Amino acid sequence: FCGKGYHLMSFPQSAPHGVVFLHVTYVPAQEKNFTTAPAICHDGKAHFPREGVFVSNGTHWFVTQRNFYEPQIITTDNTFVSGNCDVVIGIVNNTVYDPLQPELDS
């Protein structure tokens, strides 16, 4: 409706008997392949991303936002737990880091 791509903002310009809209949009570029999974199996529990998606660069699993590649460590702060690992088709095994663990470790 407001240009090709993900619309950010627009500018109106007057024209003789008309209007010209300059649509400023965000276009994704330089995409890269990653190996993905619906959920992460850890401690007999299924972990799902709160807002992102699980990706793998070949050896390590990360969670990233869907529209830009920004890999982050899969923790309990960016994932939520629902059910065990027996129901979700395609769940993979990976560790889930806990930020609270070094606090009581020290």
Partner 1 sequence: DSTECSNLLLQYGSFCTQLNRALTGIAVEQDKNTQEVFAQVKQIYKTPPIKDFGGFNFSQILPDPSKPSKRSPIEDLLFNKVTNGLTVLPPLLTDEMIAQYTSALLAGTITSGWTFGAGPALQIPFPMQMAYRFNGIGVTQNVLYENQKLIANQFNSAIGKIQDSLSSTP
Partner 2 sequence: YTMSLGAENSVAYSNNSIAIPTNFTISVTTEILPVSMTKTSVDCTMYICG
Ligand X SMILES: *[C@@H]1O[C@H](CO)[C@@H](O)[C@H](O)[C@H]1NC(C)=O
Ligand Y SMILES: *[C@@H]1O[C@H](CO)[C@@H](O[C@@H]2O[C@H](CO)[C@@H](O)[C@H](O)[C@H]2NC(C)=O)[C@H](O)[C@H]1NC(C)=O
Closest CA to 94 of 85, 105, 102: 85
Asked whether the beta carbons of 91 and 56 are under 8 A apart, the reply is: no
Distance CA 86, CA 11 (A): 52
* Minimum distance from residue 90 beta carbon to ligand X (Å): 3
Residue 16 binds which one of ligand X, partner 1, ligand Y, none, with CB within 5 to 8 A depending on kind? none
The Cα 81–Cα 96 span in angstroms is 11
Q: Which of 16, 32, 105, 106 binds ligand Y (CB under 6 A)?
A: 32
CA-CA distance, 7 to 31, in Å (whole number)?
19
- Find the binding residues for partner 1 in span 22-61 (CB under 8 A): 27-29, 31, 36, 38-39, 46, 48-49, 53
Interface residues with partner 1 (CB under 8 A) are: 4-6, 27-29, 31, 36, 38-39, 46, 48-49, 53, 66, 80, 82-83, 87-90
